[PDB]
Amino acid sequence: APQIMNVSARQTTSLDGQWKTIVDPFENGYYDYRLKPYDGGYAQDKTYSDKTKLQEYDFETDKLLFVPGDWNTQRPQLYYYEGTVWYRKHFEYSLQPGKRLFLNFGAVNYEAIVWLNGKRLGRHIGGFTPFNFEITNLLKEGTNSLVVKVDNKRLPEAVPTVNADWWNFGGITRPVTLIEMPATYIRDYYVQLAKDDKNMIEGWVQLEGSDKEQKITLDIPELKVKKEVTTDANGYASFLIKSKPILWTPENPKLYAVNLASETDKVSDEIGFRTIRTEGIKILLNDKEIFCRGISIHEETPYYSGRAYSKDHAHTLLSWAKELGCNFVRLAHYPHNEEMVREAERMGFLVWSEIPVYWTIHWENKDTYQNAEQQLCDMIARDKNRCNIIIWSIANETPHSKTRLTFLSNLANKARSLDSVRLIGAAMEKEEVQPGVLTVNDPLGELLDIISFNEYVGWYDGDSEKCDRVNWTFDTQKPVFISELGGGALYGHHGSPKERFTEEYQEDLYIRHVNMLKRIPGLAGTTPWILKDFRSPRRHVPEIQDDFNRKGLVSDKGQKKKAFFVLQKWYKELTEAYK
Amino acid sequence: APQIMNVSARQTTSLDGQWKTIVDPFENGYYDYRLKPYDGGYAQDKTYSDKTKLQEYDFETDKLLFVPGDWNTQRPQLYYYEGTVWYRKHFEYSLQPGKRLFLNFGAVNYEAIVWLNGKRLGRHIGGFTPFNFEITNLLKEGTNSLVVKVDNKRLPEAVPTVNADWWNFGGITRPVTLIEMPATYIRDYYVQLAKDDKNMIEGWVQLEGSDKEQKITLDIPELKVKKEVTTDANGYASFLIKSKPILWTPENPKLYAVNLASETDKVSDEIGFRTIRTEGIKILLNDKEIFCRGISIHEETPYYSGRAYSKDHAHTLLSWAKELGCNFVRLAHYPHNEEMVREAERMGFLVWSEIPVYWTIHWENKDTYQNAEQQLCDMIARDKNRCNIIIWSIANETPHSKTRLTFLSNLANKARSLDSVRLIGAAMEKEEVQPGVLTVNDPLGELLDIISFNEYVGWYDGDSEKCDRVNWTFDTQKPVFISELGGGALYGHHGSPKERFTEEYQEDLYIRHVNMLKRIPGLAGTTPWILKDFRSPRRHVPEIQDDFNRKGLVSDKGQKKKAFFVLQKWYKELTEAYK
Amino acid sequence: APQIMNVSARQTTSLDGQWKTIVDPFENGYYDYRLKPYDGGYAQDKTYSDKTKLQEYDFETDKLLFVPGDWNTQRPQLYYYEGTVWYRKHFEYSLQPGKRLFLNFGAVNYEAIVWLNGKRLGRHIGGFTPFNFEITNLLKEGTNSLVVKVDNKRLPEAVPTVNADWWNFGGITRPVTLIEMPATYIRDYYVQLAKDDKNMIEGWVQLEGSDKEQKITLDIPELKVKKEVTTDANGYASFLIKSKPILWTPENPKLYAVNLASETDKVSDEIGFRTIRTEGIKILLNDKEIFCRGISIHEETPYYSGRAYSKDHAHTLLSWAKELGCNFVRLAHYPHNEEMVREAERMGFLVWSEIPVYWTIHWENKDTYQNAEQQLCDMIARDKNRCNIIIWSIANETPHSKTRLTFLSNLANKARSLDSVRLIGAAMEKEEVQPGVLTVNDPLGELLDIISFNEYVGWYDGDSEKCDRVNWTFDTQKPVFISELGGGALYGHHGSPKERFTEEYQEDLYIRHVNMLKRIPGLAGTTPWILKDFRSPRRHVPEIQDDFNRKGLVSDKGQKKKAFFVLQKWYKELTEAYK
């Protein structure tokens, strides 16, 4: 049940493919007509072979869905579907006596309940974080039955809550993986530069199993590092290593082969090293002032606009951001699949990583907070060794209230207790305190390392001309980071620059908006909204939006709109200026 | 806002056809990103003509839906859809000064919010009862804008609640009608035999408007009845008329032309006269002992299985019940459209009329009770002059608890206060107190005129053989009425009589079940479940159920299964026996 | 092999329900990659149990379609589908040796190839006529396999050809029925009044089998008719019977029970008696001058607009025609299912019955002619005992050419050789010889008993005003019969009477058109186009047509448009005038 670090480097076997499925809007497979749990629900996966008896379902003859994937793009009937879909997989696995076996879900939105061979393994909430179950002693010989009850109903108390500006993609949205482990295994580990220290690698390792006291070697061959330690009675060891690694940058995204070997287990990784801090209004990477030439990205695929999960999806999306001139991507509004973060790391993109504490979260609900903090912990735990991540984001466009501030302050404190190195951010919002004077007056700012916020001057707030007659002031010397900006346009839809949703309007907006950006004191980064048009049930203009947010600089079909080249040109200028 | 009696006989103009629609799962047209109501939502029906400004919707270029109808069968994407769909209609109407105009909805499931020309008229809950709004002084010249926000999300506190065995058909499911009235009009009236009195017609009439004190004439030309009264200061008058009408029966469903004429209004109706009472275990129609040779029917169409609304739909369904040998139909589990009740009345079918107080209603919720009692009142108010209705049903398969009993007792008392003539029923459930001994031990029975209940011996409770080894006893001498019984089968699916869901199993079940029925003391009626296969999201056997309850004696494609003729044969015997 | 009269009255077993199907556009199940027919294709119906061998199909685990029905309305993917769909059904049947068994198809559009237990039974072309195969010797014990390859590709040489104004509904569109016969059975018979004779019933009976020479008795008990004859060695016998039947009329559609008994077979029927002839410009029914107050009707269902096949469908459609005031229905453009003709027979509608010799048939193709003549023969053979049919129509809107005239003259001669009683028609077209003067100048008229033609003054030919100013003349004294007229409208779409496709334009058109009809010399009948909106792939106005011909006086959803009441009022007047 605890998280497993670096699943892809383990002895893995995929369960992906096409699974049997039952769409169950009234949850008949779980509740009887008295609304009570009952024995003989769909978790038993009883093939309906003996028709002298009555049952009301049969996985064996029902329809398939692809796993991994959202269900919404797989059948017209499931486009809007919010509720329960049952998934069922049969598999065999020969597990040598003494070896251990874990079932890992990359993500399931939103609620997953999991059974193996009719026995409940457990339950998960949160649609974008991984979870696993040990099945070592539950695996049978011959056919095993895996049943997953997936529900994506929107809940007021959930994280996210009943309103958000993206599609409610339900299903087993990321790979399902069997992981074989030795009886005592390296479960988790951390290897990164010490805070603000180009010359000191620090880290720790955590074993799980009955043989917790072991010698461990941390091996970084290219650095001629070979450090041996011994774990304590809890299976834990730490280390400090003086070294001079070549530091990762967007221009040279250097990664090192890192090998961990205990007496009973071994795992290899690719890990880069960098320092990150603010100094006044400056963002310093490896002690050098940088500008975050960024773009925002949802976890949604080119062309068919389903939930992204593969290296293919990531490489295409990031290849567009590369052509745009970016050294930075904001992955909104939740943890993305690990392939996306890894491809950003290898290709040279700094990353903003976020949890979906989005809009009107139930700040007074203690279960809601525990959910948000669990997603925070899981986000950091999975990716703590990804040096390209420099900002953890704890919220996006949340309304001001005392309970909200308390909620978010506790998340910010928790984040810092988990990771003293990376910057803490959150998408705040702007105000126009007096005509023409724009600022960010949000008490949340005091808990953040950057003045990060969304603003839509020239789209939601005025026509494009308004960019020309506003200026920005901030009452603190922290780097200013505009985490969203921009406007909508349909690729191939042309007209006057005054006509909204034409490419020409969006282009004119970006020209005047960039001019405004150039006047902002302390500006250190921009991640305009957004790289690719994406699905949203709040975008209803027929033939223009058609259930897509159209603020992409690239269409959902991979076409660069006119405004793409306005931002590209400015990012080219910023690249030269920050050399 | 008060109900209008006999809408079809008024000066009516249809608004049916195809309306503009916006599917809005996150209710963006109603709530902003702070989850607050906002000015400029979709109720304003602003055509998106000026694209120099931003808006996120446009009825004028969006997709159509048919009105009336469920949305589920109209688009694959809407099959399972639970949530909000906006409907918009433009119309003109020339209303002579001084005349009044009402907007009548036959039904909208589940919640309707209605605007005219951007102004909210009001809101309705309950998916099967009519409601109207006066628009006399809101109608403009030229184009008028009617916007209806329809939501069919299942609510725990709603009536019905989050679980039921039929499809959640959302939409404007019955005709939308403009009704023109004189300035003071006959709004409501009642004309029926006095309780247990073949020779006394009683009734009342209710005017609405400023000229409430008027002479009124009740005219029944075939009976040579011409009774003149005067209304009181509240617009109310009553009457008692000694007369010898030919009494309505299933064999001779006699209706009389009834004309009401006040000084300012007039309306004609077709009304029949009959007495109905129990005497011990006997049901007496016009003092004659009858058997209710019935069949249950959902409000769902032949062939395409959408929500039924027209005389065409009713005539086809009732023509099947006629061929089956029925003199009675149970219209489950909610008030059906008025065309169905009228066609039953004209063709000669006694009727059981029901409200959807079904399964796990929230008995302790005072809003829930007020909803249930309002639906009860509206059900009786619409159809109080339909002499073929002899049973009002207040519940179906509700679990035993003190709060439930209090809830249902209040409904039963309310029903009797509204209608002293018709019988009060409810589908109770059976118990097997000792092996082979079946009875109905439910305290609700004390408040009902009949021992009405569902039982599924040979389908849910045992195989068909169990019918042969059980018997029934009842501790009170009230007529026994089995409101559901039977089993499932796919038309065209054949095999051994031991194989469930074959026609042969269903046939064998009905043979043994009818033999069991013939042994029941006090049996006075049966409405087996069901006439036609119907949609249910709780029926998941692939290729057999496919989201249909298969307990029809007729398939959803109009095909008579083998079991149809078993019940037909018994009903033929009962017809002879009760001559 | 030959047609069987009155299938419904035989010992029938339905094979309807849901069948396994395979969509096969490239006909992989029939042709190999050299485009050669191969054996081992899909007609073998080999369940794919042994996966150590290679096979490219499996009926056993493939998708279902309803039989009977078009495929087009059953799946979105099959909406436009033109090509091959394979259908498969398993059944058991116990046949006592000596008894015979036939497989009857009410209709399959367009080409059907049929196999039983892997052996080809034969082939049929023509989408609207029934066909039979004897399977007496091919029936096996246990599971029998019936496979039908159905193809509705449009062919230039087909009847109809590659262009027509209705949907290409493919599939097994009418019931599939097993018919058990004695070894020598009554295959066909004819019982009708002799030409122009109110007192002489003439007829013949045709036996089939090895004992064709038998005593036959024809009983009409209500008429006290008992006639015994003996068939010849060819199985044939004729009879002449003096009687005085009550003559069938639309107002009193009298039918008699007719019983035929041979030594080894017997069959009952319901048959009515009437005379029909022209007299100058008069049509006389039972010697009485009548007007054919008609409406045209396609074989398409109310509400969901699939292919009609059942008594339910027929009754709904014809109940609309009854309310419209019709005594006559034109069933276009092909033979309708037998339920429609029988319901028109019992409800009191005279019938025009037609074969799809429509538009640009290949007049020079000898196979095309034999196909048309076979459909003619089959149409008349099936319904020759339906006294409500008074017109056989051999064509609709065919271009004038010498070869077309020869083709149609041969059909007309064949029709007359098969039926000396009923009238011969065909939908001709009009022309404007001189400005403002319309007539029918088609040499086909010489071969018809009526001057029957389609005209669209006010819709295709001018605006509605043109109806007010044109005059008509005809150079022969045969009854004039307008077989189509009218215009399109969307129900619920209102505007100026000058705006085409509004109900008001259509209403204004019918008012002016009806007045035009009153001055057409010789007019004896009208069947306006059309009763119900119907599917056509030539009707592309979005939101108005949406792939429907909108010329219905009733919408596809059963709603009477304004123009319905214009024609109803004229038919009310004609009913009084012709009393």
Ligand SMILES: O=C(O)[C@H]1OC(=O)[C@H](O)[C@@H](O)[C@@H]1O
């Ligand atoms: O409105 C928009 O387009 C975007 O604006 C925002 O500030 C939201 O954070 C983002 O999720 C929306 O998609």
Ligand SMILES: O=C(O)[C@H]1OC(=O)[C@H](O)[C@@H](O)[C@@H]1O
């Ligand atoms: O289970 C069934 O088929 C039926 O049984 C019942 O008792 C319910 O009242 C009915 O709504 C269900 O459809």
Ligand SMILES: O=C(O)[C@H]1OC(=O)[C@H](O)[C@@H](O)[C@@H]1O
């Ligand atoms: O154009 C029309 O609406 C109709 O006109 C005709 O003359 C055709 O015979 C008919 O099949 C078409 O549907």
Ligand SMILES: [Cl-]
């Ligand atoms: Cl947008």
Ligand SMILES: [Cl-]
């Ligand atoms: Cl069922």
Ligand SMILES: [Cl-]
């Ligand atoms: Cl049209």
